[PDB]
Amino acid sequence: XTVINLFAPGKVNLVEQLESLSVTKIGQPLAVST
Amino acid sequence: XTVINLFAPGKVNLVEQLESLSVTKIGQPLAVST
Amino acid sequence: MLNSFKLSLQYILPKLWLTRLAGWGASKRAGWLTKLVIDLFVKYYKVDMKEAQKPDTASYRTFNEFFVRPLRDEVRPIDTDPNVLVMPADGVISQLGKIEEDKILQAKGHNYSLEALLAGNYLMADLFRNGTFVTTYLSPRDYHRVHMPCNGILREMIYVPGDLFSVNHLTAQNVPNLFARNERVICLFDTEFGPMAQILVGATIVGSIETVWAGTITPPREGIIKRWTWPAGENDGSVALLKGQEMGRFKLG
Amino acid sequence: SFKLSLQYILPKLWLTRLAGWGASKRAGWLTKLVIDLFVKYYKVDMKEAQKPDTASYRTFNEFFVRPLRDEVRPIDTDPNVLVMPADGVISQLGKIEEDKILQAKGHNYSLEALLAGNYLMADLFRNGTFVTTYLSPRDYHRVHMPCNGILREMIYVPGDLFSVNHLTAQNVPNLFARNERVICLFDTEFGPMAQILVGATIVGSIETVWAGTITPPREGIIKRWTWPAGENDGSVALLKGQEMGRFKLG
Ligand SMILES: CCCCCCCCCCCCO[C@@H]1O[C@H](CO)[C@@H](O[C@H]2O[C@H](CO)[C@@H](O)[C@H](O)[C@H]2O)[C@H](O)[C@H]1O
Ligand code: NA
Numbered sequence: 001x002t003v004i005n006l007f008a009p010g011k012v013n014l015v016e017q018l019e020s021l022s023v024t025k026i027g028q029p030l031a032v033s034t
Numbered sequence: 035x036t037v038i039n040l041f042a043p044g045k046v047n048l049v050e051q052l053e054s055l056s057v058t059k060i061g062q063p064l065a066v067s068t
Numbered sequence: 069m070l071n072s073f074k075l076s077l078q079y080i081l082p083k084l085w086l087t088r089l090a091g092w093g094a095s096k097r098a099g100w101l102t103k104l105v106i107d108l109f110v111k112y113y114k115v116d117m118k119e120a121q122k123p124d125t126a127s128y129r130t131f132n133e134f135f136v137r138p139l140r141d142e143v144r145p146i147d148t149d150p151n152v153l154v155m156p157a158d159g160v161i162s163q164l165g166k167i168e169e170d171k172i173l174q175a176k177g178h179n180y181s182l183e184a185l186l187a188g189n190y191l192m193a194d195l196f197r198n199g200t201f202v203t204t205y206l207s208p209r210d211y212h213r214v215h216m217p218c219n220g221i222l223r224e225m226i227y228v229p230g231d232l233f234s235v236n237h238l239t240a241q242n243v244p245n246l247f248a249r250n251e252r253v254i255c256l257f258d259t260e261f262g263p264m265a266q267i268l269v270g271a272t273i274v275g276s277i278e279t280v281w282a283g284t285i286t287p288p289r290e291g292i293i294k295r296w297t298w299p300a301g302e303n304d305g306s307v308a309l310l311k312g313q314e315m316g317r318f319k320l321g
Numbered sequence: 322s323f324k325l326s327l328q329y330i331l332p333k334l335w336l337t338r339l340a341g342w343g344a345s346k347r348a349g350w351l352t353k354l355v356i357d358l359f360v361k362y363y364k365v366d367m368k369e370a371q372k373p374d375t376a377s378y379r380t381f382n383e384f385f386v387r388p389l390r391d392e393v394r395p396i397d398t399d400p401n402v403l404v405m406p407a408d409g410v411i412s413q414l415g416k417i418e419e420d421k422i423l424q425a426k427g428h429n430y431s432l433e434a435l436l437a438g439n440y441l442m443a444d445l446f447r448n449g450t451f452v453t454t455y456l457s458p459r460d461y462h463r464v465h466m467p468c469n470g471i472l473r474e475m476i477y478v479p480g481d482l483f484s485v486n487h488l489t490a491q492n493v494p495n496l497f498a499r500n501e502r503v504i505c506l507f508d509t510e511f512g513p514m515a516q517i518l519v520g521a522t523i524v525g526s527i528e529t530v531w532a533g534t535i536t537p538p539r540e541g542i543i544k545r546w547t548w549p550a551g552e553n554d555g556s557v558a559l560l561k562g563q564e565m566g567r568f569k570l571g
């Protein structure tokens with residue numbers, strides 16, 4: 001296994017399509033700067 | 035089990051008779067202010 | 069109380085001794101027997117060997133060599149918007165979203181403490197209260213190395229002893245503090261997006277954790293918290309990593 | 322050496338919970354029998370107990386945490402004297418050599434590791450003084466204040482339940498830094514003071530007088546409580562030789 005990321009308040013927005021059980025692939029968008 | 039005491043540097047002197055395997059009893063002297 | 073044979077095994081099974089036994093076996097050069105176990109694994113978990121640099125299962129001398137196999141670069145293009153942070157790991161999102169003050173979601177309806185995940189480090193928790201979290205689960209079929217979401221200067225690493233519970237829907241729903249009680253490595257970075265933590269959490273069998281700067285962190289398991297620090301990026305002795313670069317991995321043992 | 326290997330093989334936590342279950346049972350004649358066998362084998366001095374009558378204890382744990390008659394533990398009256406918090410024997414004592422505390426001849430452990438990586442708390446005690454007291458099965462199992470103290474911080478630290486004896490003190494690395502323990506930090510007239518209660522196999526249950534039973538349960542995470550400075554609402558103050566906590570089975 002498990003990787004946990006933490007980001008500071010106000011700093012990133014998670015890509016809106018991602019939810020529990022969304023497939024992840026290295027290099028694909030996770031979050032965007034605010 | 036075990037009790038560990040920590041004291042700040044230069045604050046107490048351990049009574050000089052105490053060593054490894056000295057019998058302890060609650061209320062008996064352990065240390066003195068410097 | 070949930071009366072569940074499978075759940076009770078999590079508490080009865082000698083998870084540490086099974087993890088050490090698996091690490092012993094996975095480190096062995098066992099020729100045909102290595103290849104057999106890898107082939108059974110590849111079949112049962114539906115591993116995609118076409119993404120691997122070495123697609124031939126005979127090319128791996130040890131099961132652990134196979135478990136940590138590299139991918140062909142072409143197959144994981146790194147997004148080029150510098151405003152975009154990318155997924156550090158192949159697998160599936162477990163949970164993600166807002167850190168609700170000190171609370172992170174483990175499963176629908178089940179929270180755990182940010183401060184507990186960070187081994188009682190309230191100064192580090194102060195960086196992330198009301199922030200954002202992402203939990204990625206890597207399954208046996210997935211690539212087991214972990215890459216950077218963005219450019220980062222490494223500032224702090226914390227090794228946290230803990231349990232080796234399995235991670236699945238059953239334990240996510242029923243084991244309190246699952247990720248805060250499992251053996252893990254906390255990595256804290258300075259980034260363009262402020263402080264960022266990337267935490268590698270072990271599980272039963274898959275209990276060995278490496279970083280690219282420190283090598284194998286575990287095993288062995290010395291039972292104590294260990295802390296490393298590095299200076300700010302402008303200073304001698306700093307460690308910097310780029311977006312999509314390898315930062316660590318998991319393996320058996 | 323066989324005995325050392327068992328430390329790593331034995332289901333220490335399940336044996337501790339089994340003993341806790343048994344020790345919490347109001348089992349009449351069987352409670353009294355186990356107490357009497359224990360008193361015989363460990364040569365317990367029941368004359369020092371408030372209730373010397375072994376039938377007066379409804380649970381083995383009630384017996385294990387038995388109070389003493391006040392007369393038999395007179396508290397030193399020099400206000401410049403700190404007193405022993407526990408009946409037993411000194412394991413090791415002396416100077417904290419920068420971050421290093423002596424476990425046994427030729428084995429050190431880290432002050433920061435004992436304090437579960439709390440570097441700000443370690444900074445209070447670097448180059449300070451430590452005392453490690455071992456309580457045996459025959460000893461009184463409550464722990465008393467070495468001096469007047471205002472409680473400021475308590476930290477519950479999950480960990481192992483290794484046995485504590487000469488063999489493990491000599492051979493188990495980080496014995497006290499890896500065992501389940503409760504760290505208590507006080508303001509005193511002699512500066513910051515820590516009193517740390519470290520569990521062992523069987524004797525794994527830790528209480529304080531302000532919080533009750535800290536463990537069990539064992540929820541696998543560090544927990545931290547804070548209290549204000551003295552003479553503030555919510556403050557917790559204890560006098561020299563007052564009871565501050567105890568150990569029991571479970
Ligand atoms: C999930 C984990 C499961 C992974 C699958 C494999 C696990 C099975 C464990 C069985 C033990 C096999 O043990 C393995 O035997 C072969 C014999 O060919 C040895 O082979 C190697 O070392 C021996 C000497 O030690 C040399 O003579 C030999 O030329 C060399 O290649 C390995 O060094 C040994 O590690
Ligand atoms: Na192998």
Ligand code: NA
Nearest residue numbers: 088287288289
């Ligand atoms: Na180990």
